[PDB]
Amino acid sequence: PITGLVYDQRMMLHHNMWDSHHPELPQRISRIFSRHEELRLLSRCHRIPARLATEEELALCHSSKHISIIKSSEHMKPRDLNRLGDEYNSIFISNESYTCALLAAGSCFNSAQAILTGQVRNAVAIVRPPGHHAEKDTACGFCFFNTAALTARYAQSITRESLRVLIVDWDVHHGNGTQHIFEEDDSVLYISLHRYEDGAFFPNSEDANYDKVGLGKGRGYNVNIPWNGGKMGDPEYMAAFHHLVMPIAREFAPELVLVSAGFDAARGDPLGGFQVTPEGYAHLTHQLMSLAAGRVLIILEGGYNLTSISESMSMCTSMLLGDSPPSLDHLTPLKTSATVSINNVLRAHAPFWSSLR
Numbered sequence: 254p255i256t257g258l259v260y261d262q263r264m265m266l267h268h269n270m271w272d273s274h275h276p277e278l279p280q281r282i283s284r285i286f287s288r289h290e291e292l293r294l295l296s297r298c299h300r301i302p303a304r305l306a307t308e309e310e311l312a313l314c315h316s317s318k319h320i321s322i323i324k325s326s327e328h329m330k331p332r333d334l335n336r337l338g339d340e341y342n343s344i345f346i347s348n349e350s351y352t353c354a355l356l357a358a359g360s361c362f363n364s365a366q367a368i369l370t371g372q373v374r375n376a377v378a379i380v381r382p383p384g385h386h387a388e389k390d391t392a393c394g395f396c397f398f399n400t401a402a403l404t405a406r407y408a409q410s411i412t413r414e415s416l417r418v419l420i421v422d423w424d425v426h427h428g429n430g431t432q433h434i435f436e437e438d439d440s441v442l443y444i445s446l447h448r449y450e451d452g453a454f455f456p457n458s459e460d461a462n463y464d465k466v467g468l469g470k471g472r473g474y475n476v477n478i479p480w481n482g483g484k485m486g487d488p489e490y491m492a493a494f495h496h497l498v499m500p501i502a503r504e505f506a507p508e509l510v511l512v513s514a515g516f517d518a519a520r521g522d523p524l525g526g527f528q529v530t531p532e533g534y535a536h537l538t539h540q541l542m543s544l545a546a547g548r549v550l551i552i553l554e555g556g557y558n559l560t561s562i563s564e565s566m567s568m569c570t571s572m573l574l575g576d577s578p579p580s581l582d583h584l585t586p587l588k589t590s591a592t593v594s595i596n597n598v599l600r601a602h603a604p605f606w607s608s609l610r
């Protein structure tokens with residue numbers, strides 16, 4: 254089995270002209286790439302080239318207006334760049350942002366194509382800016398276009414329209430954009446785990462609560478696992494996977510798994526406040542590899558401690574390459590609120606998934 258890897262230094266060009274220390278740093282991707290080299294994982298992977306997404310591809314998920322506005326930023330002077338970014342929630346823009354967002358998406362399309370044609374079994378995409386907060390019609394939360402959502406639709410466009418895609422979003426933040434894009438869709442199952450705090454944590458919406466199960470044709474196909482009142486870590490994530498993610502995923506029987514793999518739930522993250530370990534992410538990856546005949550694409554989302562994200566994503570790639578899982582620390586009993594969260598999701602989704610009964 255072959256594992257693909259996409260990384261392109263051009264995605265470092267997106268930068269914050271006013272706050273060069275903003276946490277969504279260019280070196281997030283070069284540091285992850287370096288750690289793959291240091292651990293001798295890079296030479297064990299097959300390099301997949303980056304490419305630009307086309308505007309037609311962007312329209313798989315995004316409005317023509319939103320595409321046009323971000324595209325227009327390539328030609329803006331700093332004053333226009335600053336004013337435009339301030340129109341969104343938590344966005345900075347440079348003249349290279351649009352290109353970098355296109356490369357992040359195109360890299361993932363090429364990776365999904367390699368998986369779906371059997372050139373590689375699985376793959377990892379070391380991309381920025383991230384995607385999961387981007388909505389059909391707007392940028393948000395450091396994200397311009399929803400790379401994972403676009404990759405699901407691209408995957409369908411090269412196979413069949415109803416290809417079953419599972420998106421597991423383990424970034425510490427709810428992927429509001431991904432949920433909304435697929436909220437009425439039963440071909441793309443969205444499962445997010447996220448710090449919620451009764452709606453107080455970014456992106457600050459009750460759309461992230463467990464009772465949002467999807468709409469219309471998509472009822473049952475949106476699974477939110479929201480954490481409240483606890484510094485969650487490996488025990489809680491393992492339990493959510495055992496009780497919720499894996500039973501639902503096996504019942505859905507995806508033909509492709511995309512991971513919105515933010516590493517901001519990681520021990521050491523300056524924004525997430527959680528303590529998932531690199532060995533925890535490895536175990537989560539190893540479990541997902543049992544789905545979809547192993548067709549798994551791991552897409553970088555957030556994650557802001559450069560050391561934590563480099564170790565964590567490298568451990569995921571080690572799993573994709575077939576290395577055995579490292580040993581978890583002794584798992585403490587779940588924080589009591591985590592048991593409450595899991596049981597709330599079970600009650601919300603047992604109507605739709607007989608594996609939860």
Ligand SMILES: NCc1ccc(C(=O)CS)cc1
Pocket residue numbers: 343383386394395424426455515517524554555556
């Ligand atoms: N300014 C609020 C904010 C916006 C985005 C993030 C992420 O980490 C997105 S993945 C965190 C905080």
Ligand SMILES: [K+]
Pocket residue numbers: 422423424425426427428445446447
């Ligand atoms: K998430």
Ligand SMILES: [K+]
Pocket residue numbers: 435436437438439441442443467471474475
């Ligand atoms: K859905």
Ligand SMILES: [Zn+2]
Pocket residue numbers: 424425426515517554555556
């Ligand atoms: Zn995040």
